PDB file of N, CA and C in Angstrom:
ATOM      1  N   UNK A   1      58.073 143.998  85.757  1.00 28.76           N
ATOM      2  CA  UNK A   1      58.089 142.559  85.539  1.00 28.76           C
ATOM      3  C   UNK A   1      59.513 142.041  85.441  1.00 28.76           C
ATOM      4  N   UNK A   2      60.269 142.190  86.525  1.00 30.06           N
ATOM      5  CA  UNK A   2      61.601 141.613  86.611  1.00 30.06           C
ATOM      6  C   UNK A   2      61.584 140.181  87.113  1.00 30.06           C
ATOM      7  N   UNK A   3      60.458 139.725  87.662  1.00 29.24           N
ATOM      8  CA  UNK A   3      60.362 138.341  88.105  1.00 29.24           C
ATOM      9  C   UNK A   3      60.271 137.378  86.931  1.00 29.24           C
ATOM     10  N   UNK A   4      59.695 137.819  85.814  1.00 30.71           N
ATOM     11  CA  UNK A   4      59.598 136.944  84.653  1.00 30.71           C
ATOM     12  C   UNK A   4      60.970 136.684  84.048  1.00 30.71           C
ATOM     13  N   UNK A   5      61.810 137.716  83.981  1.00 27.45           N
ATOM     14  CA  UNK A   5      63.184 137.513  83.545  1.00 27.45           C
ATOM     15  C   UNK A   5      63.916 136.545  84.460  1.00 27.45           C
ATOM     16  N   UNK A   6      63.650 136.610  85.763  1.00 27.70           N
ATOM     17  CA  UNK A   6      64.325 135.712  86.686  1.00 27.70           C
ATOM     18  C   UNK A   6      63.853 134.279  86.501  1.00 27.70           C
ATOM     19  N   UNK A   7      62.557 134.081  86.260  1.00 27.33           N
ATOM     20  CA  UNK A   7      62.074 132.728  86.008  1.00 27.33           C
ATOM     21  C   UNK A   7      62.662 132.169  84.720  1.00 27.33           C
ATOM     22  N   UNK A   8      62.797 133.012  83.694  1.00 27.14           N
ATOM     23  CA  UNK A   8      63.424 132.559  82.455  1.00 27.14           C
ATOM     24  C   UNK A   8      64.882 132.180  82.676  1.00 27.14           C
ATOM     25  N   UNK A   9      65.619 133.000  83.428  1.00 26.59           N
ATOM     26  CA  UNK A   9      67.007 132.673  83.732  1.00 26.59           C
ATOM     27  C   UNK A   9      67.110 131.363  84.498  1.00 26.59           C
ATOM     28  N   UNK A  10      66.186 131.121  85.426  1.00 27.68           N
ATOM     29  CA  UNK A  10      66.211 129.872  86.179  1.00 27.68           C
ATOM     30  C   UNK A  10      65.972 128.675  85.272  1.00 27.68           C
ATOM     31  N   UNK A  11      64.977 128.770  84.386  1.00 24.66           N
ATOM     32  CA  UNK A  11      64.711 127.661  83.473  1.00 24.66           C
ATOM     33  C   UNK A  11      65.901 127.389  82.565  1.00 24.66           C
ATOM     34  N   UNK A  12      66.582 128.442  82.110  1.00 24.34           N
ATOM     35  CA  UNK A  12      67.730 128.241  81.232  1.00 24.34           C
ATOM     36  C   UNK A  12      68.889 127.591  81.981  1.00 24.34           C
ATOM     37  N   UNK A  13      69.192 128.093  83.176  1.00 21.30           N
ATOM     38  CA  UNK A  13      70.344 127.601  83.917  1.00 21.30           C
ATOM     39  C   UNK A  13      70.135 126.207  84.487  1.00 21.30           C
ATOM     40  N   UNK A  14      68.901 125.818  84.809  1.00 17.77           N
ATOM     41  CA  UNK A  14      68.681 124.454  85.279  1.00 17.77           C
ATOM     42  C   UNK A  14      69.026 123.441  84.200  1.00 17.77           C
ATOM     43  N   UNK A  15      68.817 123.804  82.936  1.00 18.44           N
ATOM     44  CA  UNK A  15      69.154 122.903  81.842  1.00 18.44           C
ATOM     45  C   UNK A  15      70.636 122.987  81.524  1.00 18.44           C
ATOM     46  N   UNK A  16      71.211 124.185  81.604  1.00 19.42           N
ATOM     47  CA  UNK A  16      72.599 124.339  81.189  1.00 19.42           C
ATOM     48  C   UNK A  16      73.560 123.679  82.169  1.00 19.42           C
ATOM     49  N   UNK A  17      73.376 123.905  83.468  1.00 16.39           N
ATOM     50  CA  UNK A  17      74.332 123.476  84.478  1.00 16.39           C
ATOM     51  C   UNK A  17      73.998 122.127  85.094  1.00 16.39           C
ATOM     52  N   UNK A  18      73.121 121.358  84.485  1.00 16.24           N
ATOM     53  CA  UNK A  18      72.746 120.075  85.056  1.00 16.24           C
ATOM     54  C   UNK A  18      73.867 119.063  84.845  1.00 16.24           C
ATOM     55  N   UNK A  19      74.265 118.319  85.873  1.00 17.67           N
ATOM     56  CA  UNK A  19      75.368 117.368  85.717  1.00 17.67           C
ATOM     57  C   UNK A  19      74.915 116.045  85.124  1.00 17.67           C
ATOM     58  N   UNK A  20      75.769 115.478  84.278  1.00 17.25           N
ATOM     59  CA  UNK A  20      75.519 114.158  83.726  1.00 17.25           C
ATOM     60  C   UNK A  20      75.771 113.100  84.796  1.00 17.25           C
ATOM     61  N   UNK A  21      75.268 111.889  84.560  1.00 18.55           N
ATOM     62  CA  UNK A  21      75.287 110.883  85.612  1.00 18.55           C
ATOM     63  C   UNK A  21      75.117 109.495  85.010  1.00 18.55           C
ATOM     64  N   UNK A  22      75.850 108.520  85.560  1.00 18.69           N
ATOM     65  CA  UNK A  22      75.737 107.096  85.221  1.00 18.69           C
ATOM     66  C   UNK A  22      75.601 106.853  83.718  1.00 18.69           C
ATOM     67  N   UNK A  23      76.297 107.656  82.918  1.00 18.21           N
ATOM     68  CA  UNK A  23      76.063 107.764  81.484  1.00 18.21           C
ATOM     69  C   UNK A  23      77.362 108.122  80.779  1.00 18.21           C
ATOM     70  N   UNK A  24      77.243 108.822  79.653  1.00 19.04           N
ATOM     71  CA  UNK A  24      78.349 109.258  78.805  1.00 19.04           C
ATOM     72  C   UNK A  24      79.457 109.982  79.570  1.00 19.04           C
ATOM     73  N   UNK A  25      79.311 110.089  80.889  1.00 15.17           N
ATOM     74  CA  UNK A  25      80.245 110.755  81.790  1.00 15.17           C
ATOM     75  C   UNK A  25      81.629 110.113  81.751  1.00 15.17           C
ATOM     76  N   UNK A  26      81.820 109.134  80.861  1.00 11.70           N
ATOM     77  CA  UNK A  26      82.915 108.166  80.886  1.00 11.70           C
ATOM     78  C   UNK A  26      84.239 108.782  81.320  1.00 11.70           C
ATOM     79  N   UNK A  27      84.898 108.125  82.267  1.00 12.16           N
ATOM     80  CA  UNK A  27      86.107 108.637  82.885  1.00 12.16           C
ATOM     81  C   UNK A  27      87.340 108.044  82.227  1.00 12.16           C
ATOM     82  N   UNK A  28      88.455 108.744  82.376  1.00 14.89           N
ATOM     83  CA  UNK A  28      89.731 108.248  81.899  1.00 14.89           C
ATOM     84  C   UNK A  28      90.359 107.328  82.935  1.00 14.89           C
ATOM     85  N   UNK A  29      91.582 106.894  82.653  1.00 14.03           N
ATOM     86  CA  UNK A  29      92.401 106.349  83.717  1.00 14.03           C
ATOM     87  C   UNK A  29      92.714 107.467  84.705  1.00 14.03           C
ATOM     88  N   UNK A  30      93.259 107.094  85.856  1.00 16.95           N
ATOM     89  CA  UNK A  30      93.446 107.940  87.027  1.00 16.95           C
ATOM     90  C   UNK A  30      92.125 108.200  87.726  1.00 16.95           C
ATOM     91  N   UNK A  31      91.001 107.776  87.159  1.00 19.44           N
ATOM     92  CA  UNK A  31      89.725 107.734  87.854  1.00 19.44           C
ATOM     93  C   UNK A  31      89.300 106.296  88.104  1.00 19.44           C
ATOM     94  N   UNK A  32      89.357 105.460  87.076  1.00 17.49           N
ATOM     95  CA  UNK A  32      89.071 104.035  87.189  1.00 17.49           C
ATOM     96  C   UNK A  32      90.343 103.233  87.432  1.00 17.49           C
ATOM     97  N   UNK A  33      91.120 103.629  88.432  1.00 17.26           N
ATOM     98  CA  UNK A  33      92.343 102.930  88.807  1.00 17.26           C
ATOM     99  C   UNK A  33      92.060 102.152  90.078  1.00 17.26           C
ATOM    100  N   UNK A  34      92.245 100.841  90.017  1.00 20.30           N
ATOM    101  CA  UNK A  34      92.094  99.998  91.191  1.00 20.30           C
ATOM    102  C   UNK A  34      93.406  99.940  91.952  1.00 20.30           C
ATOM    103  N   UNK A  35      93.394 100.403  93.201  1.00 19.00           N
ATOM    104  CA  UNK A  35      94.605 100.318  94.008  1.00 19.00           C
ATOM    105  C   UNK A  35      94.839  98.893  94.485  1.00 19.00           C
ATOM    106  N   UNK A  36      93.758  98.157  94.739  1.00 19.55           N
ATOM    107  CA  UNK A  36      93.874  96.813  95.289  1.00 19.55           C
ATOM    108  C   UNK A  36      94.553  95.873  94.306  1.00 19.55           C
ATOM    109  N   UNK A  37      94.161  95.938  93.034  1.00 16.30           N
ATOM    110  CA  UNK A  37      94.737  95.042  92.039  1.00 16.30           C
ATOM    111  C   UNK A  37      96.206  95.354  91.795  1.00 16.30           C
ATOM    112  N   UNK A  38      96.570  96.634  91.792  1.00 12.62           N
ATOM    113  CA  UNK A  38      97.974  96.992  91.639  1.00 12.62           C
ATOM    114  C   UNK A  38      98.791  96.543  92.838  1.00 12.62           C
ATOM    115  N   UNK A  39      98.239  96.681  94.042  1.00 13.02           N
ATOM    116  CA  UNK A  39      98.939  96.211  95.230  1.00 13.02           C
ATOM    117  C   UNK A  39      99.155  94.705  95.176  1.00 13.02           C
ATOM    118  N   UNK A  40      98.145  93.961  94.730  1.00 12.52           N
ATOM    119  CA  UNK A  40      98.280  92.514  94.619  1.00 12.52           C
ATOM    120  C   UNK A  40      99.318  92.129  93.570  1.00 12.52           C
ATOM    121  N   UNK A  41      99.246  92.753  92.392  1.00 14.38           N
ATOM    122  CA  UNK A  41     100.226  92.500  91.344  1.00 14.38           C
ATOM    123  C   UNK A  41     101.642  92.762  91.825  1.00 14.38           C
ATOM    124  N   UNK A  42     101.852  93.863  92.544  1.00 11.88           N
ATOM    125  CA  UNK A  42     103.200  94.182  92.995  1.00 11.88           C
ATOM    126  C   UNK A  42     103.666  93.223  94.080  1.00 11.88           C
ATOM    127  N   UNK A  43     102.773  92.834  94.992  1.00 13.62           N
ATOM    128  CA  UNK A  43     103.096  91.783  95.953  1.00 13.62           C
ATOM    129  C   UNK A  43     103.646  90.553  95.244  1.00 13.62           C
TER     130      UNK A  43
ATOM    131  N   UNK B   1     118.862  40.760  93.488  1.00 15.55           N
ATOM    132  CA  UNK B   1     118.983  41.934  94.342  1.00 15.55           C
ATOM    133  C   UNK B   1     118.422  43.160  93.635  1.00 15.55           C
ATOM    134  N   UNK B   2     117.880  44.095  94.411  1.00 15.84           N
ATOM    135  CA  UNK B   2     117.397  45.370  93.896  1.00 15.84           C
ATOM    136  C   UNK B   2     117.920  46.474  94.803  1.00 15.84           C
ATOM    137  N   UNK B   3     118.200  47.631  94.221  1.00 15.50           N
ATOM    138  CA  UNK B   3     118.695  48.766  94.988  1.00 15.50           C
ATOM    139  C   UNK B   3     117.520  49.619  95.444  1.00 15.50           C
ATOM    140  N   UNK B   4     117.637  50.182  96.640  1.00 17.28           N
ATOM    141  CA  UNK B   4     116.644  51.102  97.175  1.00 17.28           C
ATOM    142  C   UNK B   4     117.173  52.521  97.030  1.00 17.28           C
ATOM    143  N   UNK B   5     116.530  53.308  96.179  1.00 16.82           N
ATOM    144  CA  UNK B   5     116.957  54.668  95.901  1.00 16.82           C
ATOM    145  C   UNK B   5     116.077  55.657  96.645  1.00 16.82           C
ATOM    146  N   UNK B   6     116.704  56.609  97.324  1.00 15.60           N
ATOM    147  CA  UNK B   6     115.995  57.743  97.898  1.00 15.60           C
ATOM    148  C   UNK B   6     116.179  58.938  96.977  1.00 15.60           C
ATOM    149  N   UNK B   7     115.080  59.496  96.487  1.00 14.27           N
ATOM    150  CA  UNK B   7     115.181  60.659  95.623  1.00 14.27           C
ATOM    151  C   UNK B   7     114.820  61.910  96.403  1.00 14.27           C
ATOM    152  N   UNK B   8     115.658  62.944  96.380  1.00 16.59           N
ATOM    153  CA  UNK B   8     115.397  64.143  97.178  1.00 16.59           C
ATOM    154  C   UNK B   8     114.113  64.844  96.765  1.00 16.59           C
ATOM    155  N   UNK B   9     113.779  65.867  97.538  1.00 20.50           N
ATOM    156  CA  UNK B   9     112.481  66.523  97.494  1.00 20.50           C
ATOM    157  C   UNK B   9     112.561  67.739  96.585  1.00 20.50           C
ATOM    158  N   UNK B  10     111.728  67.767  95.553  1.00 21.38           N
ATOM    159  CA  UNK B  10     111.570  68.935  94.699  1.00 21.38           C
ATOM    160  C   UNK B  10     110.122  69.381  94.789  1.00 21.38           C
ATOM    161  N   UNK B  11     109.913  70.642  95.147  1.00 22.14           N
ATOM    162  CA  UNK B  11     108.580  71.168  95.377  1.00 22.14           C
ATOM    163  C   UNK B  11     108.380  72.447  94.588  1.00 22.14           C
ATOM    164  N   UNK B  12     107.130  72.714  94.247  1.00 23.80           N
ATOM    165  CA  UNK B  12     106.741  74.001  93.703  1.00 23.80           C
ATOM    166  C   UNK B  12     106.181  74.867  94.818  1.00 23.80           C
ATOM    167  N   UNK B  13     106.247  76.175  94.622  1.00 25.04           N
ATOM    168  CA  UNK B  13     105.821  77.091  95.665  1.00 25.04           C
ATOM    169  C   UNK B  13     104.313  77.022  95.860  1.00 25.04           C
ATOM    170  N   UNK B  14     103.902  76.825  97.108  1.00 27.31           N
ATOM    171  CA  UNK B  14     102.502  76.706  97.487  1.00 27.31           C
ATOM    172  C   UNK B  14     101.864  78.055  97.780  1.00 27.31           C
ATOM    173  N   UNK B  15     102.471  78.829  98.670  1.00 27.14           N
ATOM    174  CA  UNK B  15     101.989  80.139  99.064  1.00 27.14           C
ATOM    175  C   UNK B  15     102.942  81.199  98.545  1.00 27.14           C
ATOM    176  N   UNK B  16     102.554  82.461  98.704  1.00 31.07           N
ATOM    177  CA  UNK B  16     103.378  83.548  98.197  1.00 31.07           C
ATOM    178  C   UNK B  16     104.389  84.051  99.216  1.00 31.07           C
ATOM    179  N   UNK B  17     103.945  84.556 100.354  1.00 29.72           N
ATOM    180  CA  UNK B  17     104.840  84.752 101.493  1.00 29.72           C
ATOM    181  C   UNK B  17     104.146  84.128 102.692  1.00 29.72           C
ATOM    182  N   UNK B  18     104.264  82.814 102.825  1.00 30.69           N
ATOM    183  CA  UNK B  18     103.559  82.100 103.865  1.00 30.69           C
ATOM    184  C   UNK B  18     102.050  82.115 103.770  1.00 30.69           C
ATOM    185  N   UNK B  19     101.472  82.919 102.883  1.00 29.73           N
ATOM    186  CA  UNK B  19     100.031  83.018 102.717  1.00 29.73           C
ATOM    187  C   UNK B  19      99.704  82.970 101.237  1.00 29.73           C
ATOM    188  N   UNK B  20      98.447  82.678 100.923  1.00 29.35           N
ATOM    189  CA  UNK B  20      97.949  82.854  99.565  1.00 29.35           C
ATOM    190  C   UNK B  20      97.135  84.139  99.527  1.00 29.35           C
ATOM    191  N   UNK B  21      97.629  85.131  98.792  1.00 26.83           N
ATOM    192  CA  UNK B  21      97.060  86.464  98.898  1.00 26.83           C
ATOM    193  C   UNK B  21      95.843  86.659  98.011  1.00 26.83           C
ATOM    194  N   UNK B  22      95.527  85.714  97.132  1.00 25.74           N
ATOM    195  CA  UNK B  22      94.328  85.864  96.316  1.00 25.74           C
ATOM    196  C   UNK B  22      93.071  85.759  97.170  1.00 25.74           C
ATOM    197  N   UNK B  23      92.988  84.717  97.991  1.00 25.82           N
ATOM    198  CA  UNK B  23      91.842  84.543  98.875  1.00 25.82           C
ATOM    199  C   UNK B  23      91.790  85.634  99.936  1.00 25.82           C
ATOM    200  N   UNK B  24      92.940  85.950 100.531  1.00 27.59           N
ATOM    201  CA  UNK B  24      93.011  87.023 101.513  1.00 27.59           C
ATOM    202  C   UNK B  24      92.542  88.329 100.899  1.00 27.59           C
ATOM    203  N   UNK B  25      92.902  88.576  99.643  1.00 27.47           N
ATOM    204  CA  UNK B  25      92.523  89.825  99.000  1.00 27.47           C
ATOM    205  C   UNK B  25      91.033  89.861  98.698  1.00 27.47           C
ATOM    206  N   UNK B  26      90.457  88.732  98.285  1.00 23.99           N
ATOM    207  CA  UNK B  26      89.005  88.642  98.130  1.00 23.99           C
ATOM    208  C   UNK B  26      88.283  89.024  99.419  1.00 23.99           C
ATOM    209  N   UNK B  27      88.609  88.323 100.506  1.00 20.39           N
ATOM    210  CA  UNK B  27      87.910  88.559 101.763  1.00 20.39           C
ATOM    211  C   UNK B  27      88.166  89.973 102.258  1.00 20.39           C
ATOM    212  N   UNK B  28      89.371  90.496 102.028  1.00 20.51           N
ATOM    213  CA  UNK B  28      89.672  91.845 102.461  1.00 20.51           C
ATOM    214  C   UNK B  28      88.906  92.888 101.680  1.00 20.51           C
TER     215      UNK B  28
END
């Protein structure tokens, strides 16, 4: 019964390695940097 | 008698470099 261990590993890893999205993922600067607004300001 | 005075032209800047870049930047 090595398939049961594999199913358990799959269930664990699907929860562990799942990526966050449209949520607490909050980014720093250098991610939310608008190039257009800086170009306009410098113009 | 009254004097007729010509006063020279003082203007504020209309465009930035021949264009207004706010509207251009919106559309772009």
